[PDB]
Each structure stands twice: as structure tokens, then as C-alpha cells.
Amino acid sequence: HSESMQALLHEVDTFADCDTNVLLHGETGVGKERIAQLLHEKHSRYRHGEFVPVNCGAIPDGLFESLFFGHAAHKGYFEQAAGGTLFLDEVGDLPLYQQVKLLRVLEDGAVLRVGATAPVKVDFRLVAASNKKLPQLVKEGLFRADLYYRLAVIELSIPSLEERGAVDKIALFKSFVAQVVGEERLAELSDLPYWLTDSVADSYFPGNVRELRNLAERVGVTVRQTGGWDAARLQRLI
Numbered sequence: 001h002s003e004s005m006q007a008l009l010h011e012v013d014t015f016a017d018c019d020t021n022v023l024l025h026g027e028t029g030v031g032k033e034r035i036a037q038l039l040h041e042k043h044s045r046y047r048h049g050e051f052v053p054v055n056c057g058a059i060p061d062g063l064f065e066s067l068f069f070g071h072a073a074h075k076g077y078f079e080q081a082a083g084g085t086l087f088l089d090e091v092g093d094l095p096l097y098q099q100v101k102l103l104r105v106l107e108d109g110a111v112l113r114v115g116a117t118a119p120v121k122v123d124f125r126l127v128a129a130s131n132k133k134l135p136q137l138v139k140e141g142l143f144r145a146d147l148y149y150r151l152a153v154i155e156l157s158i159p160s161l162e163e164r165g166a167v168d169k170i171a172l173f174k175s176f177v178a179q180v181v182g183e184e185r186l187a188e189l190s191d192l193p194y195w196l197t198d199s200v201a202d203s204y205f206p207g208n209v210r211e212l213r214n215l216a217e218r219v220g221v222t223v224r225q226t227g228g229w230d231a232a233r234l235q236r237l238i
């Protein structure tokens with residue numbers, strides 16, 4: 001890995017095993033959910049519960065209540081993350097009202113299942129992630145200051161691929177390709193063409209590691225289904 005990743009994983013080593021809330025920063029596809037899964041499985045207690053991922057930017061207002069609090073039957077995300085870790089991706093995309101309901105769950109430590117009269121305690125580790133400048137959203141009143149100061153305790157910054165550099169881009173590409181083709185079959189084929197890795201290293205990935213994994217999956221499947229490195233087929237993919 002590069003220096004950015006080693007520093008980041010060092011932060012993870014320091015801060016994984018404790019109950020404090022974590023806020024992850026980074027562009028789309030840098031690997032924020034992977035980091036949250038790391039934090040989950042390096043927690044000594046919460047590792048035994050479920051990892052519950054939630055994209056707050058794909059929840060329609062009509063279903064927020066059902067999806068988060070459940071029904072008296074449906075189990076919401078809070079109760080699904082009992083003894084585990086809740087990953088709140090795109091937390092900045094929450095509307096203000098849903099921000100307030102979340103902060104009230106976080107402060108009181110309980111949820112009311114829709115259609116119930118007694119609230120039920122809840123215990124989970126909170127990892128939230130955003131790709132936006134949350135403090136500046138708070139200055140504009142698009143994000144609530146109470147929720148922010150409750151979320152933004154352990155802050156981690158996940159580097160982009162352009163920050164990680166060409167050596168890390170090429171190593172990620174190669175391990176993804178090897179995972180798609182099989183290291184043993186890769187051994188029985190020609191070497192990976194140099195123009196391919198050069199092209200990878202000199203390309204900008206807006207989608208960061210998601211986009212790069214997609215490219216390596218297309219490459220690996222082409223190789224797997226044709227039995228070699230077709231330069232026309234591969235060239236089409238760049």
C-alpha cells in the first residue's frame with residue numbers, strides 16, 4: 001500500500017476497538033464501506049452482531065419510518081444492528097426531520113417500532129460516512145449541528161486513488177484481475193501487457209476503487225473467456 005493507506009489503517013488500528021462514533025470522509029468508491037467493515041470486525045464486542053449498511057440517499061420519505069424503526073412485523077436498521085455496527089452512508093443526504101429522529105435514537109438509546117407503545121433499547125456502534133463538507137452544510141443549515149457534533153468524533157479520511165498513486169492503482173488492478181482469472185491460470189498465460197498497466201496507472205478514476213474493480217472485472221472476464229490477452233478487446237475497455 002501507499003503512505004496514505006498505511007496512515008489510515010494505523011488510525012483504524014488505534015480507534016477500532018471502542019464504542020465511540022466514527023465519521024468517514026472520502027469520494028464515491030474510495031472504499032468507505034470496506035473501512036466500516038474493518039472497524040466492525042476489529043471491535044471485540046460488536047464483531048459478533050450484524051454489519052448493517054444503509055444508504056441514506058436512497059430512502060424515500062414515505063418509507064424512512066418503516067425502514068429505520070420497523071413495525072409491530074418488520075425489524076428496522078437500528079434493531080438489525082443490535083450488538084453490531086450500523087453503517088450510515090451518505091448521511092449528509094438525510095433530510096432534517098430524519099436527522100432529528102436519528103439523533104433522538106442516538107441520545108435516548110431506544111426506538112419505537114411503528115405500531116408499538118413501548119420503546120426498546122438499542123446498542124450498536126455508529127460508523128457514518130459522507131462525501132460532502134458537512135461543517136459547511138451546517139453553516140447553511142442543511143445539516144443539524146447537534147447531529148454533527150454527535151457524529152463527528154473519530155474522523156477518518158480515506159484517500160482517493162489519485163492520492164494513493166500509481167503503485168497502489170496497479171497493485172489493486174492486479175489483485176482484482178487475479179481474483180477474477182485465478183492466480184494459477186494467470187500463471188499459465190502470457191504476462192499482463194505493459195501498455196495495460198501503464199494505461200491503468202495514467203488514467204483518472206472518478207469512481208475510484210469501484211470503477212477500477214469494474215475495469216479489472218471486465219479485463220479478467222475477457223481473459224477468462226478468450227484464454228489470453230486480446231489487445232483489441234482490452235483496448236476497447238480503456
Ligand SMILES: Nc1nc2c(ncn2[C@@H]2O[C@H](COP(=O)(O)OP(=O)(O)OP(=O)(O)O)[C@@H](O)[C@H]2O)c(=O)[nH]1
Pocket residue numbers: 026027028029030031032033034035089090129172175209210213
Ligand atoms: N482489495 C481492496 N479492495 C478495496 C480497497 N478499497 C476499496 N476496495 C473495494 O472497492 C469497492 C469500493 O466499494 P465501497 O468500499 O463500498 O465504497 P465507498 O467508498 O463506500 O463508496 P460510496 O458508497 O460511494 O461512499 C469494494 O468492492 C471494496 O471492497 C482496498 O484497499 N483493497
Ligand SMILES: [Mg+2]
Pocket residue numbers: 032033089
Ligand atoms: Mg457503500
